[PDB]
Amino acid sequence: QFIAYIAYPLDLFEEGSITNVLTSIVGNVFGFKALRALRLEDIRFPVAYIKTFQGPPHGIQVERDKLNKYGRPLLGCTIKPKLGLSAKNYGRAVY
Amino acid sequence: SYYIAPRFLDKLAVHITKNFLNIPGVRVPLILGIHGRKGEGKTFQCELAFEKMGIEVTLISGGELESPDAGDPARLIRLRYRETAELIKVRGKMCVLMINDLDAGAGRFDEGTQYTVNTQLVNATLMNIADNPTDVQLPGSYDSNPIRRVPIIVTGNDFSTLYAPLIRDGRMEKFYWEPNRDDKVGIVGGIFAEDGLSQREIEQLVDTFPKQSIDFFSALRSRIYDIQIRDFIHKVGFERISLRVVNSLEAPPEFKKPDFSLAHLIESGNLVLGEQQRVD
Amino acid sequence: SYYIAPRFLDKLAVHITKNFLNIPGVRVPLILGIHGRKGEGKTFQCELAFEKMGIEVTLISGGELESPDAGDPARLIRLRYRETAELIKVRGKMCVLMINDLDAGAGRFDEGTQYTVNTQLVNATLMNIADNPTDVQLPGSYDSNPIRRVPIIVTGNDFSTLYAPLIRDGRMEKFYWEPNRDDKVGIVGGIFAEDGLSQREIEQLVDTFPKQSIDFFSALRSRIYDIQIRDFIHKVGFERISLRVVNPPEFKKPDFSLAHLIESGNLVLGEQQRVD
Amino acid sequence: SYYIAPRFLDKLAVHITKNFLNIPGVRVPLILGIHGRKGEGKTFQCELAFEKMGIEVTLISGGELESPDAGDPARLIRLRYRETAELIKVRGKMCVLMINDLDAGAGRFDEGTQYTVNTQLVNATLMNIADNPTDVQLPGSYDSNPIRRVPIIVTGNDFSTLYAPLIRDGRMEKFYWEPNRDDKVGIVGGIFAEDGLSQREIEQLVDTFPKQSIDFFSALRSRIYDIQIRDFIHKVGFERISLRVVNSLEAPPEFKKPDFSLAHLIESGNLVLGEQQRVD
Amino acid sequence: GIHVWHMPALVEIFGDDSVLQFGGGTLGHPWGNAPGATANRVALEACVQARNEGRNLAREGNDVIREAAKWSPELAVACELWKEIKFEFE
Ligand SMILES: Nc1ncnc2c1ncn2[C@@H]1O[C@H](COP(=O)(O)OP(=O)(O)OP(O)(O)=S)[C@@H](O)[C@H]1O
Ligand SMILES: Nc1ncnc2c1ncn2[C@@H]1O[C@H](COP(=O)(O)OP(=O)(O)OP(O)(O)=S)[C@@H](O)[C@H]1O
Ligand SMILES: Nc1ncnc2c1ncn2[C@@H]1O[C@H](COP(=O)(O)OP(=O)(O)O)[C@@H](O)[C@H]1O
Ligand SMILES: [Mg+2]
């Protein structure tokens, strides 16, 4: 068992597409019959390829400024059960 | 109708048989190598033996993997080995792959005196096959399924020092084939069987040239039409020998079957001896 | 199924392990030298040992240490050493360089023979690797980047005819291999383990032919088997030998009897005496 | 905690310093050549000396001074001299070139051995470097621009088999090494310093084996550790010894200090003499 | 990873309602893409013709490819390059 390092050129992939880069790397290598097992550990993205993506619509900094919440971690809750309740009974639990 | 020496046949039989046989506790050499003088007939005997047995043969030229502008020997030997293994299943008969002039016929002067990059590749490829005969792998489309083991024959003048590991390991067997008086009579007898020579006559030919290659005696038959051609030229005349033969619509030249006598063969033998003597 | 002598395996194992361990304050020899009589199983027992531990071997043949080019045998050693050092780094397991039959290349017998620069150089190279295992240079630009230490195993027939500085306690650990009665019994008992012979019967075979090498017994088995296979080919016939082999009926098992194993061995010695 | 012999340290110290210093009207040899007997510690005491002072070493192997290319070993020395000269300018500390085992490089054993031209050139290259330490020309276009002066240290068993003009007062400082009883006591005492023996006991070890090189005593210590190591291999198991040592997620094994007494050391010492006699 | 010799087995296993795609099989022909396509087409149509008549493609499959190659020069070159293999389907 070993870690293998592989380099790919920039002009091999479509700009602003996670779909294309993911299809290219992990397409037909995991079904190669001469390997028992394979796991992709990590990918390095270059600066030139990052600039083609939008990224997060807002980010951490803007989110806190819109909500006016700082100095503390945010709190959340999931309504139970997963399935069953009516629309009115759902909103009653939410309130 | 060519004669085969019993010893040569025996060495081929045992090697092929033993590899195909499945006896526990027994180790068998995969590769057999034959070294001898040139024009001994090692290649000719191999081809004949296989026909009598009826076993399929795959031939790989020595110059096909020695040439710099040929491809890749490492990729080639592997590909030929797989293809031969397929024959056994489909054909249902024993199949052998053999190589001629592994270190010769390249055009190079050394003849294994100095190694090459290409020389190293064959050693590497062969050693991998000898250790793991059951599984052989190409660059792509790796198959998990095992292949039937295939025997390998190799012929040359001599074997390089690089092969010494294999021989010590006992993975390779080396056979030195040298002709004898009995062998000569058989081979010479077979060549001239169609002509019709007495037993006493055949013995005289071998006795005339006791220390000769097998190739020489075969080459003697060729120089029987020489007298006819030389005499023919005279009737036609030197002025217009070319034009009539080269590009003219006429009856093709006809030659009566040459008379076969011992005297003619001795005279012809002497001329070839003289020429070979002067050249070397 | 093959019996390795416990003395032989322990000498190899302790040599390789100690090279790979970094015990502080101790200087270790990088070369282990095995010498003795011909055909005693110096090479064969190494291959069994390396298979057991599952450790990669880089071989250099003895008939390679003398070429028509000056320095070409010396350049090969450095090239093969650097290749093996990387295999320790990449494969992440123990790798060993084994030079077999060094006596032929770097040796110096009588003064009646004509030697070259290469004899001088092959001795010189092995000295410097043993001094600096971490600093071996490839021809061209110098790099001061350290490499992995690789142990060397060296087989020979005699080391008396070899440059004096290459044989010293600090540079080479010496091992004289002469198989004793107990070794012979084990090894011969390993060859004929499959056939089915009692301990007492194996003892008798060694006693009958005491002045024999390990190869002799293994060569004896092949002779017993070859007669049997030759007869089988004749009985079945050349015309249809392929039909009754691909898909072995009517094949009598080899003799393998103590009484005969003496008889056949005597015939081999008689054949050897004929040449002698 | 290794003992470096005062004579050896003084001789090497003064040679390097005197090159890097500039005294007007004094001409100094570039090469220092140390010779003696095998295993007296020429190479080894140099290495301790270079580490104490903390100075860079460029190493040339003696078995590298002959190649299939003509003038390629001549090119090598000229290249390595420039490389070392650059390290003085950049790093700003003393740097030294060392050719270990010159004897078997540019030397002639007998008057019957066929030599090449490379031997002739290697002698000449060192002659010219020692004459002009400042002007060494890299092949191609000429450039008259000085480089730093670099000292060279040379090891050998015998210098008697070497080109005569290369060994002379003005070109090479000669130094012959042979340790005395006081040196031996000091060095051997340095080896077993952590072990803990009395002065009288150290004397006795030297007395028992008086006709022995330094390497002999160091080789004793290797043999003592065998039992512990053999036990470790069994406990782990022969099947997976490689994994534990080379590539394992565990702390490397610890060995307790074996019993060190004069009686046990002499026992082991006689065992090493017996092994040497076996080959003799 | 399929060539002209895999044709009788693929036709029999996958049936009629299927698509057979040759990546390296068509392009890797010694003469080009156009003879490489014609070799594959002749090999397929000969097996379809033999199936309809009433012949087992396990026993007579190799015989059909050899018979079709007698009149098709494009297939004869393809049979020389790629060697015949034996499928063990029953
Ligand atoms: N331990 C063994 N078990 C079974 N067969 C052995 C064994 N040892 C040796 N043999 C056989 O006898 C031969 C021994 O010769 P080698 O392996 O070449 O070693 P060697 O001949 O002692 O080394 P040289 O020639 O002195 S450098 C082998 O080829 C085997 O066929
Ligand atoms: N000063 C020392 N202190 C401790 N051990 C030493 C000392 N000097 C030498 N040794 C040991 O003895 C060995 C001497 O080896 P070398 O340095 O090669 O001697 P040498 O005279 O250069 O040998 P030749 O002539 O090249 S063979 C070393 O491997 C050390 O283990
Ligand atoms: N048994 C034989 N009967 C007839 N001709 C033979 C025989 N053996 C060899 N030859 C002749 O030898 C020539 C080919 O030699 P070849 O087989 O290549 O020998 P080698 O491989 O030893 O060089 C041909 O002219 C062939 O007729
Ligand atoms: Mg030294």
Side-chain angles (χ1 to χ4, degrees), chain A, chain B residues 1-63 65-113 115-193 195-199 201-210 212-238 240-255 258-279, chain C residues 1-193 195-249 251 254-275, chain D residues 1-193 195-253 255-256 258-279, chain E residues 1-87 89:
Chain A
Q1 210 182 262
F2 66 97
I3 308 294
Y5 293 87
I6 303 148
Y8 302 90
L10 180 63
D11 64 327
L12 207 84
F13 306 91
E14 200 183 334
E15 295 96 311
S17 181
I18 289 301
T19 318
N20 186 57
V21 64
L22 215 278
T23 315
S24 181
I25 305 301
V26 306
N28 285 300
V29 69
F30 279 77
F32 194 67
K33 285 177 183 177
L35 308 167
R36 291 183 84 88
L38 189 73
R39 200 193 195 197
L40 177 64
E41 288 284 316
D42 204 358
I43 291 172
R44 203 280 299 267
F45 289 100
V47 175
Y49 194 69
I50 289 157
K51 294 297 280 172
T52 63
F53 291 89
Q54 182 192 285
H58 304 283
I60 301 161
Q61 184 210 67
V62 188
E63 187 165 63
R64 282 195 183 271
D65 290 324
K66 275 187 169 184
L67 290 159
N68 206 346
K69 294 169 181 288
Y70 9 70
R72 191 180 54 84
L74 305 166
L75 285 163
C77 174
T78 321
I79 298 302
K80 303 294 152 187
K82 279 180 164 73
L83 298 100
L85 290 157
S86 65
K88 185 90 185 294
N89 290 7
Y90 203 87
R92 192 191 295 278
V94 165
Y95 162 73
Chain B
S1 179
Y2 304 106
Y3 180 92
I4 301 182
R7 281 189 302 141
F8 198 94
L9 181 60
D10 283 10
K11 212 85 182 68
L12 261 179
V14 174
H15 187 71
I16 296 156
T17 304
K18 204 185 285 198
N19 282 278
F20 273 93
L21 285 182
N22 218 341
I23 292 97
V26 179
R27 63 178 312 155
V28 311
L30 184 71
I31 309 153
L32 175 80
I34 321 160
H35 52 83
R37 280 162 41 198
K38 264 137 89 168
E40 273 315 347
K42 290 188 300 310
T43 320
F44 202 83
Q45 303 281 39
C46 279
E47 209 177 326
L48 275 182
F50 294 144
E51 185 148 46
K52 286 185 180 285
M53 286 186 195
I55 53 180
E56 283 284 27
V57 198
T58 310
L59 289 156
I60 179 162
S61 180
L65 53 103
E66 284 308 301
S67 190
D69 56 341
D72 184 35
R75 196 186 164 262
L76 176 67
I77 298 164
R78 285 176 185 279
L79 192 68
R80 291 305 178 223
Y81 189 78
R82 298 193 72 67
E83 268 191 13
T84 308
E86 301 323 312
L87 291 173
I88 299 143
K89 298 170 222 191
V90 183
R91 310 307 306 271
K93 63 177 83 175
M94 298 198 293
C95 299
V96 183
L97 165 79
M98 84 173 290
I99 323 167
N100 304 304
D101 293 340
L102 194 63
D103 295 338
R108 274 197 317 108
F109 286 123
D110 286 325
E111 300 174 340
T113 304
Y115 66 78
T116 312
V117 176
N118 282 280
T119 313
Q120 310 298 38
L121 264 182
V122 177
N123 281 276
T125 314
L126 275 178
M127 278 174 198
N128 282 32
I129 300 167
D131 285 337
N132 293 328
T134 55
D135 61 315
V136 171
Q137 297 316 329
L138 274 159
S141 71
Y142 171 83
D143 67 327
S144 58
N145 283 323
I147 74 160
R148 294 280 309 274
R149 102 193 277 159
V150 165
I152 306 168
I153 312 298
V154 158
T155 60
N157 292 287
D158 185 54
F159 289 102
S160 75
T161 71
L162 280 151
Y163 284 113
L166 295 160
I167 310 150
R168 184 165 165 165
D169 296 330
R171 289 195 299 262
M172 202 197 175
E173 201 142 40
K174 271 169 72 197
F175 179 47
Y176 179 84
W177 149 261
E178 197 176 346
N180 61 51
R181 182 168 168 169
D182 297 335
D183 291 340
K184 254 152 190 154
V185 173
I187 297 154
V188 165
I191 287 157
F192 288 123
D195 297 344
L197 294 181
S198 68
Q199 293 286 334
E201 274 167 345
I202 295 154
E203 295 296 330
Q204 259 173 285
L205 272 185
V206 177
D207 279 25
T208 315
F209 327 114
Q212 288 296 307
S213 297
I214 298 300
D215 193 30
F216 167 80
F217 279 102
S218 175
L220 285 171
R221 287 185 92 256
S222 296
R223 309 151 66 99
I224 56 176
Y225 294 88
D226 286 41
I227 186 150
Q228 286 180 330
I229 293 157
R230 201 180 49 76
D231 281 31
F232 172 42
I233 296 296
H234 285 105
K235 288 273 180 283
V236 162
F238 291 96
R240 54 186 175 90
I241 49 148
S242 63
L243 178 64
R244 295 175 76 271
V245 160
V246 159
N247 193 46
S248 190
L249 182 71
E250 200 183 343
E254 293 301 315
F255 296 96
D259 63 333
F260 298 102
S261 96
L262 187 70
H264 296 301
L265 294 162
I266 290 155
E267 296 307 319
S268 179
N270 290 324
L271 290 169
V272 194
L273 281 179
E275 284 178 354
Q276 202 188 328
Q277 183 195 315
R278 290 290 175 203
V279 169
Chain C
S1 190
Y2 295 96
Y3 179 83
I4 51 182
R7 293 195 300 157
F8 204 104
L9 182 71
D10 288 30
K11 203 81 200 280
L12 265 169
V14 167
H15 174 80
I16 306 174
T17 315
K18 202 196 274 164
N19 272 284
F20 275 111
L21 287 165
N22 294 304
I23 307 138
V26 184
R27 305 288 326 283
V28 304
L30 194 82
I31 317 165
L32 172 78
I34 317 161
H35 67 97
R37 276 189 291 271
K38 196 200 290 178
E40 292 302 328
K42 288 195 264 289
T43 294
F44 191 89
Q45 285 209 70
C46 290
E47 303 307 313
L48 289 164
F50 297 141
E51 197 189 302
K52 181 168 271 196
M53 297 189 216
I55 58 175
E56 276 183 25
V57 290
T58 305
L59 282 157
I60 293 161
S61 185
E64 207 160 11
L65 290 157
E66 198 67 61
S67 64
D69 299 309
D72 183 50
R75 282 214 180 277
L76 188 86
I77 304 162
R78 273 189 291 266
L79 175 76
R80 290 267 191 268
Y81 187 82
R82 268 189 85 107
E83 280 157 19
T84 309
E86 272 293 302
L87 289 189
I88 280 153
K89 198 192 84 175
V90 166
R91 309 261 211 271
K93 55 182 80 180
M94 313 208 288
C95 299
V96 183
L97 180 81
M98 204 197 87
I99 305 161
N100 198 94
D101 206 74
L102 188 78
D103 193 30
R108 279 267 270 242
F109 294 96
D110 60 337
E111 60 182 342
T113 320
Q114 202 186 334
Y115 303 92
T116 312
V117 289
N118 293 318
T119 314
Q120 191 177 298
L121 281 165
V122 154
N123 280 94
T125 304
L126 278 161
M127 270 197 282
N128 286 44
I129 305 167
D131 273 10
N132 289 301
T134 40
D135 201 298
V136 173
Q137 285 300 324
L138 217 55
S141 295
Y142 184 88
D143 59 306
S144 52
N145 198 63
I147 53 161
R148 286 301 287 275
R149 182 189 174 101
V150 187
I152 305 157
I153 310 297
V154 152
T155 310
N157 295 120
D158 173 75
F159 295 146
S160 177
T161 54
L162 209 73
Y163 189 47
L166 187 58
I167 302 129
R168 59 177 185 92
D169 294 333
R171 219 197 281 275
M172 198 194 266
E173 182 180 50
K174 313 222 78 193
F175 184 50
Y176 170 72
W177 174 250
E178 181 188 298
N180 56 54
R181 192 209 174 179
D182 298 337
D183 291 328
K184 279 206 205 87
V185 152
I187 301 157
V188 168
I191 298 157
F192 295 99
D195 310 329
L197 290 160
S198 184
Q199 294 291 326
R200 285 282 179 187
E201 289 168 348
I202 297 156
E203 308 280 349
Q204 283 172 288
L205 176 61
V206 179
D207 289 329
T208 311
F209 304 103
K211 277 187 176 182
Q212 288 305 317
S213 300
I214 306 301
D215 178 66
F216 175 81
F217 305 113
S218 59
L220 191 69
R221 190 183 169 177
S222 297
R223 275 186 60 96
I224 297 296
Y225 187 77
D226 186 35
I227 300 161
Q228 288 291 310
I229 188 156
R230 196 187 58 92
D231 297 9
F232 167 78
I233 289 158
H234 271 240
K235 276 185 175 184
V236 171
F238 278 101
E239 295 83 3
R240 56 174 202 272
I241 190 76
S242 62
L243 294 168
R244 287 183 186 174
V245 161
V246 173
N247 292 294
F251 167 40
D255 188 350
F256 287 160
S257 59
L258 168 69
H260 183 58
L261 280 170
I262 291 153
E263 180 201 317
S264 188
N266 197 288
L267 180 78
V268 178
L269 262 172
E271 195 73 51
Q272 273 189 46
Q273 198 180 45
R274 187 69 66 187
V275 187
Chain D
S1 187
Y2 292 113
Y3 184 89
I4 302 146
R7 294 188 286 144
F8 205 98
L9 182 66
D10 287 38
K11 188 79 213 285
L12 184 61
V14 170
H15 175 83
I16 289 160
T17 308
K18 210 194 278 163
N19 264 310
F20 279 105
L21 275 175
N22 293 319
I23 313 150
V26 182
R27 295 278 328 277
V28 291
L30 199 81
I31 309 167
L32 176 76
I34 316 147
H35 63 94
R37 290 198 293 267
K38 60 183 177 184
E40 303 306 318
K42 291 182 287 291
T43 311
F44 184 80
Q45 282 195 72
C46 274
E47 281 299 306
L48 301 174
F50 294 149
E51 204 188 309
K52 186 192 266 198
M53 295 180 195
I55 52 173
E56 280 273 299
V57 185
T58 306
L59 281 163
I60 298 168
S61 181
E64 208 172 315
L65 302 168
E66 182 71 55
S67 73
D69 315 293
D72 202 58
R75 277 167 182 261
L76 182 80
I77 296 162
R78 279 195 307 271
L79 182 79
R80 290 263 197 280
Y81 186 79
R82 284 176 72 84
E83 283 173 316
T84 310
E86 267 281 302
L87 284 169
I88 292 164
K89 196 180 80 185
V90 164
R91 289 260 302 276
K93 60 199 84 180
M94 309 204 285
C95 296
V96 164
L97 184 69
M98 183 149 84
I99 307 157
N100 184 61
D101 195 76
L102 182 71
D103 174 42
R108 306 198 176 213
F109 274 34
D110 72 353
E111 191 54 41
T113 299
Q114 181 267 333
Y115 281 88
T116 62
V117 69
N118 285 307
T119 309
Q120 196 178 310
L121 296 164
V122 155
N123 284 289
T125 302
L126 290 160
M127 276 203 287
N128 288 286
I129 281 182
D131 281 329
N132 303 293
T134 55
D135 193 299
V136 182
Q137 295 300 317
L138 197 72
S141 296
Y142 186 81
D143 59 305
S144 57
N145 193 45
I147 57 163
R148 283 290 298 265
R149 175 174 182 145
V150 192
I152 307 180
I153 306 303
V154 153
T155 314
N157 195 284
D158 179 82
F159 289 141
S160 181
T161 58
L162 212 71
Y163 188 48
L166 183 83
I167 290 154
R168 65 177 208 191
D169 299 312
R171 219 193 288 262
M172 183 201 272
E173 186 172 52
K174 311 228 77 176
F175 172 56
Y176 170 76
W177 172 242
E178 192 191 313
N180 54 69
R181 195 197 170 181
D182 293 325
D183 289 317
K184 278 209 215 83
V185 161
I187 296 160
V188 165
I191 287 156
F192 295 96
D195 297 17
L197 292 161
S198 64
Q199 282 298 304
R200 288 280 174 190
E201 278 168 355
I202 298 153
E203 306 288 343
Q204 279 180 294
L205 188 72
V206 182
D207 287 338
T208 311
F209 305 99
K211 288 185 170 184
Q212 296 295 312
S213 299
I214 308 301
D215 54 17
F216 174 73
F217 301 109
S218 66
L220 283 181
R221 303 200 86 253
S222 300
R223 280 198 73 90
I224 306 301
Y225 267 88
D226 282 339
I227 315 297
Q228 289 188 304
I229 286 157
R230 194 192 64 83
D231 287 8
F232 168 82
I233 295 157
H234 273 229
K235 196 186 172 185
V236 165
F238 272 94
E239 59 172 354
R240 53 158 68 203
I241 180 62
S242 62
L243 180 71
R244 176 71 190 89
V245 180
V246 163
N247 189 32
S248 192
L249 49 93
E250 288 168 31
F255 304 101
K256 53 181 186 176
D259 63 315
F260 302 131
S261 194
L262 177 76
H264 179 226
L265 289 179
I266 284 161
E267 183 194 308
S268 194
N270 201 284
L271 181 55
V272 191
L273 267 198
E275 196 79 47
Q276 272 190 32
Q277 200 193 315
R278 181 71 74 182
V279 190
Chain E
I2 40 164
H3 48 88
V4 289
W5 291 108
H6 296 154
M7 211 76 77
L10 291 165
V11 159
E12 207 191 305
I13 288 156
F14 293 94
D16 294 294
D17 290 306
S18 58
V19 178
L20 303 162
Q21 288 218 309
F22 310 98
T26 310
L27 293 150
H29 200 272
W31 285 6
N33 293 2
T38 314
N40 292 313
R41 184 70 196 263
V42 166
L44 178 91
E45 288 202 328
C47 290
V48 165
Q49 192 196 43
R51 180 185 57 85
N52 294 2
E53 288 176 347
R55 290 169 75 173
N56 207 316
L57 305 161
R59 306 281 161 266
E60 292 182 65
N62 283 35
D63 294 61
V64 176
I65 307 296
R66 267 187 277 269
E67 277 158 51
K70 303 290 276 178
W71 43 265
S72 185
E74 283 80 13
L75 186 64
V77 183
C79 289
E80 189 67 57
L81 186 74
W82 294 281
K83 297 287 170 185
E84 54 179 350
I85 70 110
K86 193 180 80 69
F87 282 95
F89 67 97

